C-alpha cells in the first residue's frame, strides 16, 4: 500500500456530511477493484460478496 | 508378523472365505499377516467383548475384521467403545457393524465401509435432476439426524447456480397424543409434486397411511426416501404407495469374501508401510481389564495413517467423520408386486440407469421432429 | 409379582441410604434392591453391568458420577451395555453435553440440568439488565456448541444478532490473538464459556490487557467460577451455581419415587414383557422400552423433595434453582435465586467489576469510522 | 364422496340439497376441511327453513 491523494465529488460530499454531523473518519481503497459481486460458486460449499 | 482376526456370525461360507484370504498377495508391503478365523453366535455384547479379549490376549492380535447377519445398531455401538476402550483398530466388514453411527468419539480408531447423509442427499438430488424435476418439498420427524440431513441439503441447495422452488419444510412429531388430527389437517397443505420424508420404518408407515387417508400419493405424487427407512427389501409394510423411490447401499453385486479380502489386504498394507516409514509398531498388553492404564503408548499414527490407503487400483480412503470416501451406492423401485428391483447405480458421483425412458406409472404422446 | 431394580454408585454409605429409601418406597407388586460398586475400567464395568442384569434382570437402571473429577466416563460404558436391549437408564449426577442428542445415547433420563440451560439463563439475566449487543466468547467443543447454539437460537427468537462471536482452540498456550480482535469492537457485555483450566489463562491475559476496569462487565458459567479460576478470578464477575448439585441423597428419592410411579404406571399394560435375564444368552431388544420410556417421560411429577420433577422433549430434567453469586472482597456471596420464571434480588449489594457501584452501560459509542 | 370432494378448487360453492343432507355434507367437508378460512358456500332458501 502507498499513500496517494483522493478528491472529488464523493469526497466533497463526505466532508459537507462529517461537517454537518460532526464525526471523523480514514478513507482507504478497496483492494480487490471491484464494484461487489456475491460469489455462490458450489466448489467451496460457501458463499460470499466480494 | 500381525495377526489379524475375522469373526463370522450366523450361517456362512467360511471355507470360501478361506480361500480368498490365503491367495491375499502383500510380499512388496513386507506385512506377512497371520490371519485368525473365528466363528460365533449372537449370543450377545457381552460375549464378544470376552471373544475379542480372548483373541486379542491369545497371539499378539493387532487387528480385527467383524461381521454379522443380524440388524441391530447396538452391537456396532458395542464394537466403537470397546475399539475406543483397547485402543486397537477395528473395522467393520457388513451386517450390523456397518451401520453408520452418527457421533464418534474423539479418541476412537474406527473404520467404516458406507456412504454419509449428505452422500445420500446428493445422490438423490442428482437422481431428481435427471429426472428433469425441478420443485419438492421436506418432511421429517423428530430424529436428530432427519434435521440434520435437512439442514445439509437445504445448504446445499441454496447455493445453487440453477433454479429450485421449495414450498415449505415440515416438524410435525409422531409422538403427541391425539396430534394426529393436527398432523392430518397440516398434511393437506402440501401442494408440490415431489416430497421427500425423512423418519423411521414405523413412522414412515403411519406417516403413509395418514396420507392415504388424506389421498395425496395416487396419481400425481412422487415420495423420496433415505437409505434407512427401507432396511430390508426382502419385507414390505404393504402401506408404502406404488412407485416409491429410495436409495441403498450395494449388497446386490458386491461379494462378501472378496470385500473381506480386499479390507483385511489393505488394512495390512497401510499397517506395513505405517511400521516401515514411522518404525513405531503398538503391541501393548493385550488385555480387557485394568487398562486404564493401558493408554501410555499413544496409537493416534496408526489411525492418522489409516485414512490414506490403496492397493489392486481401488481408492479405500476414510474421511475425518469415519465414512469412505468413494461408496457405491443403488437406486431401486418398487414395481407392482411388493418387491424391489435394482433400477440404477451411482459411484464416484456418476450415476447410470438401465433406461433412457423412465417408465410412467391416452396421454404421454411421442412426436418426431426434424 | 415381583419386580427388582438396580443402580450402580460407589460411597457404600449411600448404598446403606439407597437401601433404606427402598425399604422405606415399599410401603408405598414388591421391588427389591441390587447394587454393585464401580471398577477402574470401562470394559470391566460392562461386564459387571452385563452380569448383574443377568443375574436381576431390572428394568431400569441407576447411574451416577464417581469420585472421578471428570465424571464423564462413567456414564459411557453402562449406557453403552444397556442400550442393547434398549432398556431405560436414569443419570442422577451426569451434567454434560455429548449426551444431549438422543442419537449416540438412545435411553437416558437426567436429574439434574445440562450446560444448555445456561445459555436461558444468560438470556434471562440479560433481559433483565437491558442489554444489546454481547460478545460470545466459547470454547471450541461439543458443550461450547450447544451453548452457542442456544444462545443463537434465543437470539433469534428476537431478531437480534450477536455483535462478535470468537472460537478458540481446547489448550492453546496463547490467546491474545483472539483477546486483541475482540477488544477492537464497541460492545461490552462478554461472555466467557469454556473449561477451569483455560478460564485462568483467558482471564490473565483479558488482566494484563486493561479490559477489565471500569466499563466492562463479565458474564461467566458454573465451570469458570471453580476450579483454580478463582485464584485468578477478577472483582465484579456473575457467576452462576446449583441449588443441589453438589447434594446426591436428595435427587435419589425423587429418583426412586418418578421410577416407582412409572412402574405402578406400567405393570397395568397388555403384552408386557420383562427384561430378559439371559445377559450372555439373548442379544435382543425388549420390546418394553419404548413404550415404559414414553410413559416416563410423560410422567409429571406432583411434588418432591427438590421440587417439580419434569422432563423435556431431549430428556432433560427442567424447572432447576440457581444461585447467583458474586466475588467480593476475594469471598463469594449470593446475590439472588431464579426459580425459572424470574429471578428475584436479595437485600444485598452488588459490587459491580471495577469498584462502580452504578450499573455499568456496558456498551460505548464509535466515532472514529472506516 | 369424500374422495371427490376434494376436487373443489374454486373459492365459491353453491349447494343445492335438504337439512340433513346438508349438515352431513357440512361435515364431510369439515372431515376435508375446505371450509375454514378460504371457502364460502351459497344455499337456498329450503337449506334453512
Given at each position: 500500500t502507498?499513500?496517494?491523494?483522493?478528491?472529488?465529488?464523493?469526497?466533497?460530499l463526505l466532508?459537507?456530511?462529517a461537517?454537518?454531523?460532526?464525526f471523523?473518519?480514514?478513507?482507504?481503497?478497496?483492494?480487490?477493484g471491484?464494484?461487489?459481486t456475491?460469489?455462490?460458486?458450489q466448489?467451496?460449499n460457501?458463499?460470499?460478496?466480494? | 508378523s500381525?495377526?489379524?482376526?475375522?469373526?463370522?456370525?450366523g450361517?456362512s461360507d467360511?471355507?470360501?472365505?478361506k480361500?480368498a484370504?490365503?491367495?491375499?498377495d502383500?510380499?512388496?508391503?513386507?506385512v506377512?499377516p497371520?490371519?485368525?478365523?473365528?466363528?460365533?453366535?449372537?449370543?450377545?455384547?457381552?460375549?464378544?467383548?470376552?471373544?475379542?479379549?480372548?483373541?486379542?490376549s491369545?497371539?499378539?492380535?493387532?487387528g480385527?475384521?467383524f461381521?454379522?447377519?443380524?440388524?441391530?445398531?447396538?452391537?456396532?455401538?458395542i464394537?466403537?467403545f470397546?475399539?475406543?476402550?483397547?485402543?486397537?483398530?477395528?473395522?467393520?466388514?457388513?451386517?450390523?457393524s456397518?451401520m453408520?453411527?452418527?457421533?464418534?468419539?474423539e479418541?476412537?480408531?474406527?473404520?467404516?465401509?458406507?456412504?454419509?447423509?449428505?452422500?445420500q442427499?446428493?445422490?438423490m438430488?442428482?437422481?431428481?435432476?435427471?429426472?428433469d424435476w425441478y420443485?419438492?418439498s421436506?418432511?421429517?420427524?423428530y430424529?436428530p439426524?432427519?434435521?440434520?440431513?435437512?439442514?445439509?441439503?437445504?445448504?446445499?441447495?441454496?447455493?445453487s447456480?440453477?433454479?429450485?422452488?421449495?414450498?415449505?419444510?415440515?416438524?410435525?412429531?409422531m409422538?403427541?397424543?391425539?396430534?394426529d388430527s393436527?398432523?392430518?389437517?397440516?398434511?393437506?397443505?402440501?401442494?408440490?409434486?415431489?416430497?421427500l420424508?425423512?423418519?423411521?420404518?414405523?413412522?414412515a408407515?403411519?406417516?403413509?397411511?395418514?396420507?392415504?387417508?388424506?389421498?395425496?400419493?395416487?396419481?400425481?405424487?412422487t415420495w423420496?426416501?433415505?437409505?434407512?427407512?427401507?432396511?430390508?427389501?426382502d419385507?414390505?409394510?404393504?402401506?408404502?404407495?406404488?412407485?416409491?423411490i429410495?436409495?441403498?447401499?450395494?449388497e446386490?453385486?458386491?461379494?462378501?469374501?472378496a470385500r473381506?479380502?480386499?479390507?483385511?489386504?489393505?488394512?495390512?498394507?497401510a499397517?506395513?508401510?505405517?511400521?516401515?516409514?514411522?518404525?513405531?509398531?503398538p503391541?501393548?498388553?493385550?488385555?480387557?481389564?485394568?487398562?486404564?492404564?493401558?493408554?501410555?503408548y499413544?496409537?493416534?499414527?496408526?489411525?492418522?495413517?489409516?485414512?490414506?490407503?490403496?492397493?489392486?487400483?481401488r481408492?479405500?480412503?476414510?474421511?475425518?467423520?469415519?465414512?469412505?470416501?468413494?461408496p457405491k451406492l443403488?437406486?431401486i423401485?418398487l414395481?407392482?408386486?411388493?418387491?424391489?428391483?435394482r433400477?440404477?447405480?451411482?459411484?464416484?458421483?456418476?450415476?447410470?440407469?438401465?433406461?433412457?425412458?423412465?417408465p410412467r406409472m391416452?396421454?404421454?404422446?411421442?412426436?418426431?421432429?426434424? | 409379582?415381583?419386580?427388582?431394580?438396580?443402580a450402580?454408585l460407589?460411597?457404600?454409605?449411600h448404598?446403606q441410604?439407597?437401601?433404606?429409601a427402598?425399604?422405606?418406597?415399599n410401603?408405598?407388586?414388591?421391588?427389591?434392591?441390587?447394587?454393585?460398586?464401580?471398577?477402574?475400567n470401562?470394559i470391566?464395568?460392562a461386564?459387571?453391568?452385563?452380569?448383574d442384569?443377568?443375574?436381576?434382570?431390572?428394568?431400569?437402571?441407576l447411574?451416577?458420577?464417581?469420585?472421578?473429577p471428570?465424571?464423564h466416563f462413567?456414564?459411557?460404558?453402562?449406557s453403552?451395555t444397556?442400550?442393547f436391549?434398549?432398556?431405560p437408564?436414569?443419570?442422577?449426577?451426569?451434567?454434560?453435553?455429548?449426551?444431549?442428542?438422543?442419537?449416540?445415547?438412545?435411553?437416558?433420563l437426567?436429574?439434574?440440568?445440562?450446560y444448555?440451560?445456561?445459555?436461558?439463563?444468560?438470556?434471562?439475566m440479560?433481559?433483565?439488565?437491558?442489554?444489546?449487543?454481547?460478545?460470545?466468547?466459547?470454547?471450541?467443543d461439543?458443550?461450547?456448541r450447544?451453548a452457542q447454539?442456544?444462545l443463537?437460537t434465543?437470539?433469534?427468537?428476537?431478531?437480534?444478532?450477536?455483535?462478535?462471536?470468537?472460537?478458540?482452540?481446547?489448550?492453546?498456550?496463547?490467546?491474545?490473538?483472539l483477546?486483541?480482535?475482540?477488544?477492537?469492537?464497541?460492545?461490552?457485555?462478554?461472555?466467557?464459556?469454556?473449561?477451569?483450566?483455560?478460564?485462568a489463562t483467558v482471564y490473565?491475559?483479558?488482566a494484563?490487557?486493561?479490559?477489565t476496569?471500569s466499563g466492562?462487565?463479565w458474564?461467566?458459567?458454573?465451570?469458570?467460577i471453580?476450579?483454580?479460576?478463582?485464584?485468578?478470578?477478577?472483582?465484579?464477575?456473575?457467576?452462576?451455581?446449583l441449588?443441589?448439585?453438589?447434594?446426591?441423597s436428595?435427587?435419589?428419592?425423587?429418583?426412586?419415587?418418578?421410577?416407582?410411579?412409572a412402574?405402578?404406571?406400567?405393570l397395568?399394560?397388555?403384552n408386557?414383557?420383562?427384561?430378559?435375564?439371559?445377559?450372555?444368552?439373548?442379544?435382543?431388544?425388549?420390546?418394553?422400552?419404548?413404550?415404559?420410556?414414553?410413559?416416563?417421560m410423560?410422567?409429571?411429577?406432583?411434588d418432591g423433595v427438590t421440587?417439580?420433577?419434569?422432563?423435556n422433549?431431549?430428556g432433560?430434567?427442567?424447572?432447576?434453582?440457581?444461585?447467583?453469586?458474586?466475588?467480593?472482597?476475594r469471598?463469594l456471596?449470593?446475590?439472588?435465586?431464579?426459580n425459572?420464571?424470574?429471578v428475584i434480588?436479595?437485600?444485598?449489594?452488588?459490587?459491580?467489576?471495577?469498584?462502580?457501584?452504578?450499573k455499568?452501560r456496558?456498551?460505548?459509542?464509535?466515532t472514529?469510522?472506516?
Amino acid at each position: 500500500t502507498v499513500p496517494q491523494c483522493c478528491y472529488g465529488f464523493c469526497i466533497d460530499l463526505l466532508i459537507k456530511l462529517a461537517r454537518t454531523m460532526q464525526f471523523t473518519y480514514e478513507v482507504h481503497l478497496v483492494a480487490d477493484g471491484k464494484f461487489g459481486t456475491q460469489e455462490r460458486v458450489q466448489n467451496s460449499n460457501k458463499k460470499e460478496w466480494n | 508378523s500381525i495377526g489379524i482376526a475375522v469373526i463370522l456370525v450366523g450361517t456362512s461360507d467360511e471355507v470360501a472365505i478361506k480361500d480368498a484370504h490365503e491367495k491375499d498377495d502383500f510380499h512388496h508391503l513386507s506385512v506377512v499377516p497371520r490371519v485368525e478365523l473365528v466363528a460365533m453366535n449372537e449370543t450377545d455384547p457381552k460375549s464378544i467383548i470376552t471373544r475379542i479379549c480372548d483373541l486379542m490376549s491369545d497371539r499378539k492380535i493387532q487387528g480385527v475384521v467383524f461381521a454379522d447377519d443380524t440388524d441391530q445398531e447396538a452391537i456396532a455401538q458395542i464394537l466403537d467403545f470397546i475399539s475406543a476402550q483397547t485402543l486397537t483398530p477395528i473395522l467393520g466388514i457388513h451386517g450390523g457393524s456397518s451401520m453408520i453411527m452418527a457421533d464418534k468419539d474423539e479418541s476412537s480408531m474406527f473404520f467404516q465401509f458406507g456412504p454419509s447423509i449428505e452422500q445420500q442427499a446428493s445422490v438423490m438430488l442428482n437422481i431428481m435432476e435427471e429426472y428433469d424435476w425441478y420443485i419438492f418439498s421436506i418432511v421429517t420427524t423428530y430424529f436428530p439426524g432427519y434435521q440434520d440431513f435437512v439442514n445439509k441439503i437445504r445448504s446445499t441447495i441454496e447455493n445453487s447456480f440453477v433454479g429450485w422452488e421449495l414450498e415449505e419444510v415440515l416438524l410435525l412429531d409422531m409422538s403427541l397424543d391425539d396430534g394426529d388430527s393436527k398432523i392430518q389437517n397440516q398434511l393437506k397443505k402440501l401442494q408440490s409434486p415431489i416430497i421427500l420424508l425423512y423418519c423411521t420404518k414405523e413412522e414412515a408407515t403411519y406417516i403413509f397411511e395418514v396420507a392415504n387417508s388424506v389421498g395425496l400419493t395416487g396419481y400425481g405424487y412422487t415420495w423420496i426416501v433415505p437409505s434407512l427407512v427401507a432396511g430390508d427389501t426382502d419385507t414390505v409394510p404393504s402401506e408404502f404407495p406404488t412407485g416409491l423411490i429410495s436409495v441403498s447401499y450395494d449388497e446386490w453385486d458386491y461379494g462378501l469374501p472378496a470385500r473381506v479380502r480386499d479390507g483385511i489386504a489393505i488394512i495390512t498394507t497401510a499397517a506395513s508401510d505405517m511400521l516401515s516409514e514411522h518404525s513405531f509398531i503398538p503391541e501393548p498388553k493385550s488385555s480387557c481389564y485394568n487398562t486404564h492404564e493401558k493408554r501410555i503408548y499413544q496409537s493416534n499414527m496408526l489411525n492418522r495413517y489409516l485414512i490414506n490407503v490403496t492397493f489392486e487400483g481401488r481408492n479405500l480412503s476414510f474421511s475425518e467423520d469415519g465414512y469412505q470416501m468413494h461408496p457405491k451406492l443403488v437406486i431401486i423401485l418398487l414395481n407392482k408386486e411388493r418387491k424391489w428391483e435394482r433400477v440404477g447405480k451411482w459411484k464416484d458421483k456418476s450415476l447410470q440407469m438401465k433406461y433412457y425412458v423412465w417408465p410412467r406409472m391416452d396421454d404421454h404422446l411421442s412426436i418426431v421432429t426434424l | 409379582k415381583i419386580v427388582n431394580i438396580g443402580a450402580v454408585l460407589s460411597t457404600r454409605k449411600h448404598e446403606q441410604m439407597f437401601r433404606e429409601a427402598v425399604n422405606q418406597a415399599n410401603k408405598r407388586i414388591q421391588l427389591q434392591a441390587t447394587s454393585v460398586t464401580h471398577k477402574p475400567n470401562a470394559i470391566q464395568m460392562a461386564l459387571s453391568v452385563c452380569e448383574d442384569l443377568i443375574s436381576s434382570q431390572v428394568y431400569a437402571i441407576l447411574v451416577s458420577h464417581p469420585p472421578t473429577p471428570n465424571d464423564h466416563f462413567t456414564p459411557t460404558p453402562v449406557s453403552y451395555t444397556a442400550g442393547f436391549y434398549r432398556i431405560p437408564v436414569l443419570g442422577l449426577t451426569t451434567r454434560m453435553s455429548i449426551y444431549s442428542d438422543k442419537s449416540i445415547h438412545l435411553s437416558f433420563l437426567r436429574t439434574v440440568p445440562p450446560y444448555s440451560h445456561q445459555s436461558s439463563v444468560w438470556f434471562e439475566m440479560m433481559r433483565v439488565y437491558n442489554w444489546n449487543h454481547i460478545i460470545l466468547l466459547v470454547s471450541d467443543d461439543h458443550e461450547g456448541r450447544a451453548a452457542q447454539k442456544r444462545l443463537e437460537t434465543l437470539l433469534e427468537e428476537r431478531e437480534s444478532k450477536a455483535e462478535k462471536v470468537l472460537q478458540f482452540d481446547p489448550g492453546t498456550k496463547n490467546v491474545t490473538a483472539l483477546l486483541m480482535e475482540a477488544r477492537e469492537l464497541e460492545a461490552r457485555v462478554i461472555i466467557l464459556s469454556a473449561s477451569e483450566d483455560d478460564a485462568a489463562t483467558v482471564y490473565r491475559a483479558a488482566a494484563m490487557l486493561d479490559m477489565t476496569g471500569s466499563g466492562y462487565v463479565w458474564l461467566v458459567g458454573e465451570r469458570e467460577i471453580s476450579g483454580n479460576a478463582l485464584r485468578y478470578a477478577p472483582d465484579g464477575i456473575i457467576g452462576l451455581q446449583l441449588i443441589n448439585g453438589k447434594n446426591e441423597s436428595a435427587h435419589i428419592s425423587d429418583a426412586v419415587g418418578v421410577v416407582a410411579q412409572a412402574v405402578h404406571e406400567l405393570l397395568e399394560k397388555e403384552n408386557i414383557t420383562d427384561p430378559p435375564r439371559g445377559c450372555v444368552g439373548n442379544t435382543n431388544i425388549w420390546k418394553t422400552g419404548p413404550l415404559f420410556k414414553r410413559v416416563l417421560m410423560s410422567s409429571k411429577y406432583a411434588d418432591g423433595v427438590t421440587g417439580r420433577v419434569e422432563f423435556n422433549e431431549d430428556g432433560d430434567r427442567k424447572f432447576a434453582q440457581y444461585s447467583i453469586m458474586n466475588l467480593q472482597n476475594r469471598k463469594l456471596v449470593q446475590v439472588g435465586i431464579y426459580n425459572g420464571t424470574h429471578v428475584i434480588p436479595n437485600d444485598r449489594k452488588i459490587i459491580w467489576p471495577g469498584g462502580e457501584t452504578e450499573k455499568p452501560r456496558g456498551y460505548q459509542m464509535s466515532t472514529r469510522l472506516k
